[PDB]
Design an enzyme around this catalytic site. Structure first.
Site, PDB file in Angstrom:
ATOM      1  CB  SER A   1      17.110  37.218  61.731  1.00 52.65           C
ATOM      2  OG  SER A   1      17.106  38.486  61.093  1.00 52.65           O
TER       3      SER A   1
ATOM      4  CD  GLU B   1      14.388  33.795  55.814  1.00 53.23           C
ATOM      5  OE1 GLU B   1      15.184  32.879  55.573  1.00 53.23           O
ATOM      6  OE2 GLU B   1      14.740  34.806  56.410  1.00 53.23           O
TER       7      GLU B   1
HETATM    8 MG   LIG Z   1      17.142  35.123  57.698  1.00 54.77          MG
HETATM    9 ZN   LIG Z   2      15.259  38.905  60.467  1.00 53.86          ZN
HETATM   10 ZN   LIG Z   3      18.713  41.625  59.450  1.00 55.84          ZN
END
Ligand SMILES: [Mg+2]
Ligand SMILES: [Zn+2]
Ligand SMILES: [Zn+2]
Ligand SMILES: [Mg+2]
Ligand SMILES: [Zn+2]
Ligand SMILES: [Zn+2]
EC number: 3.1.3.1
Lengths: 449, 449
Positions: free
Chosen positions: A102, A322
């Site tokens: 990520s 997010e």
């Molecule tokens: Mg994250």
């Molecule tokens: Zn991610």
């Molecule tokens: Zn992940």
């Protein structure tokens, strides 16, 4: 002027057993699409990231919460759709690394350069690159950074920090793991210290634990990063009511809301998926988490406050939101926690679309940083991994499968996945694009020089 | 000068390790998208189906064949893109069955109605519904059905046969499994007898085995279905040379090309994936299959010959082209077999796209009927299913995992997936749609009814 439509209703039109009943389209779409295209400047950008939300996670959440012929009023309502790639690079060779973590994916849409798994804001040569939040602020736009994760987590962190390892949360870890970024070794600081130096107008999320860490150097040595935030002028908030009383958030009064020590609570609970869980155990109905609380703002509420405060800036704003625990729960092989977090994100996309469709000059983008593990399989599958049967809104059972690891977490996957957008310059997400292009589309939309 | 543009190049434009090197876009796309929107009537439709080609299969084949930053000149060159749903129905309850098989999904796009797994051209009450090929034929258009599978496989068969079970290939299986469809019982016949009756102008594929059966009733009782085809005016060809000697195909002399007893040869040979394959065996480099042949037509050749023969019809044509074994090798957990059939299909899409682009009035749609098992995972993955490491075009290793079945065949999955289009009415694949919507889009574009 035909100022751009959202997809109003793409639910199945009628009786899904009958001719035409399962159709999502009423008529021809050409003109609606023509009216959706505009290369005029974007005044504001709102970028919603479902961490780990590939098309599998979107289908599973839809089937469960809305029914297979259902429709997510936020997520599915964006009219321009494409698919983009998010491969990372191998640090030693410079060759593609097909499955990204990520950090490397977030660095790619925030700086427009590919990097290696683990890097935040630096390329394979460990050189920094300015992020889209640093550029927006350099042009005077307001900026916001919102997550349900701890704010040192790879995805918010990539907007404000340049470290060679996503593990450099605060001073201890940095001295150890990122020595060349360590403040006592002449570096720029830990993720958290860089967070604080970056000074976005609104930062909302979890991760209050690392703010108890005390600085090793600089004009705030011996103080905790929390004390340092206060001294430096931030208005700190720790619950929903205090967030709601905040009327100003700007450059010499920047808001920092730390609602949890680690990650904020997940919306729905359920059991973990198990070996032959669909054959051996009953179907699951997800449970609302009794401990999420009226004291802890939901993602949609954080989104909403963020937009209210940030839109007082005349120049425009950039906001990143997010939906963090889609990923975490997918890792944990917990269908209900994964789906609840996709539902939760859908409410935030709804808020964003609401504002954008009223304001007429906001590019809203909804995508994921990379694909993940869960697959929807036939109800009777005998699979080698973890499976679970769930009772969906349709009154039917859906089985989900996690089968790409024998170890601790379920892993990410490198498949291309949906990116969808609404507003000026949304055309740049249609067809095949790369995750680095998202950077250049947003920079160009906003007209950052 | 208006010509609708295809995506000429969306490969990474530079050095993947550098700022902007990985960008697939060179500028703003709004104007090129505006040039892609046409509601004018479509004269011809070419529908290319990758069986089982979800977004994972596309990414995997691009990484290996073109490199991660590469571009499929056919599959990726289509400018309008969306995601559609392909859930089937439960026959007893009429509720959603989240993972469809190859027959119910094919019935959905060719008839506009959902059905139960295993049905071809019938709804859950076993009512027959006209297919887009039958309606195109009735309206006077030329019609083509091309496949690398047996011509009795779910996909091709769905366009011409109406039976309650995909298994009812010829008289023998239909007497036992579809007694209501059985010719000697008063029914319309088996998949092959119905195909013979529908008389599409061009039908090309494998499946010569079932044409060795003799009918149980009717005018050609006791004759083989192969003799029957000849008695009914069909031009039969069984290799590349003869296929290419065909000067015309129409309703007086319809072409039936039978190029293999079963499925046609797969393009690339490779080992099957294995439990812990990526750690216990070296990386695989796929290799050309020596059996593929100078005498067996490739998918792009059959596509090209079908377009030539079918474009003589002044009124237009409808052609379905199926890259059949992407699915079959995904089932077999054979990465090379799988990727080679995806590369193979890309070639067929390039031919289709070159024709449509010069003609100006053809809608070209490239999609899949449902998603599948394979996932691109990290090199060091310890998975419970089958994995294999592959040496890609990038000179790097890609690992693929098949982890949703402990039994003989890897399963399909239910995630929504890519549909892309080019030409008049292509706008109707953008956004979220349903597989039955594709029927209505084709019906509408061709002006049928
Ligand atoms: Mg994250
Ligand atoms: Zn991610
Ligand atoms: Zn992940
Ligand atoms: Mg097929
Ligand atoms: Zn299929
Ligand atoms: Zn299959």
């Amino acid at each position: 002027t035909p100022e751009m439509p959202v997809l109003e209703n793409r639910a199945a039109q009628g009786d899904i057993t009958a001719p035409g009943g399962a159709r999502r389209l009423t008529g021809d779409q050409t003109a609606a699409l023509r009216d959706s295209l505009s290369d005029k400047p974007a005044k504001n950008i709102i970028l919603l990231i479902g961490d780990g939300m590939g098309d599998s996670e979107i289908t599973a959440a839809r089937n469960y919460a809305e029914g297979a012929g259902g429709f997510f009023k936020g997520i599915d309502a964006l009219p321009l759709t494409g698919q983009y790639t998010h491969y990372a690079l191998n640090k030693k060779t410079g060759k593609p690394d097909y499955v990204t973590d990520s950090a490397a994916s977030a660095t790619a849409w925030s700086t427009g350069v590919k990097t290696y798994n683990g890097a935040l804001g630096v390329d394979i040569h460990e050189k920094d690159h300015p992020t889209i939040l640093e550029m927006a602020k350099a042009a005077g736009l307001a900026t916001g950074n919102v997550s349900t994760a701890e704010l040192q987590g790879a995805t918010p962190a990539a907007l404000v920090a340049h470290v060679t390892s996503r593990k450099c949360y605060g001073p201890s870890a940095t001295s150890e793991k990122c020595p060349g970024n360590a403040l006592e070794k002449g570096g720029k600081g830990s993720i958290t210290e860089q967070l604080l130096n970056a000074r976005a107008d609104v930062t909302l999320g979890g991760g209050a634990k690392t703010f108890a860490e005390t600085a090793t150097a600089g004009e705030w040595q011996g103080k905790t990063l929390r004390e340092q935030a206060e001294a430096r002028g931030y208005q700190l908030v720790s619950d929903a009511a205090s967030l709601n009383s905040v009327t100003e958030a700007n450059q010499q009064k920047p808001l920092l809301g730390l609602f949890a020590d680690g990650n904020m609570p997940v919306r729905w609970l359920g059991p973990k998926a198990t070996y032959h869980g669909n054959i051996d155990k009953p179907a699951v109905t997800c449970t609302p988490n009794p401990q999420r609380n009226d004291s802890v703002p939901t993602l949609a509420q954080m989104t909403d406050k963020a937009i209210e405060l940030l839109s007082k800036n005349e120049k425009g704003f950039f906001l990143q939101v997010e939906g963090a625990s889609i990923d975490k729960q997918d890792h944990a092989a917990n269908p209900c926690g994964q789906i609840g977090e996709t539902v939760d994100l859908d409410e935030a996309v709804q808020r964003a679309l609401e504002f954008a469709k009223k304001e007429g000059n906001t590019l809203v983008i909804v995508t994921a940083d990379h694909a993940h593990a869960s697959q929807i399989v036939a109800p009777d599958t005998k699979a080698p991994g973890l499976t679970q049967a769930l009772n969906t809104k349709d009154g039917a059972v859906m089985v989900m499968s996690y089968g790409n690891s024998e170890e601790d977490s379920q892993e990410h996957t490198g498949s291309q996945l949906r990116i969808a957008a609404y507003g000026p310059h949304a055309a740049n997400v249609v067809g095949l694009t790369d995750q680095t292009d998202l950077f250049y589309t947003m920079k160009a939309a906003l007209g950052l020089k």
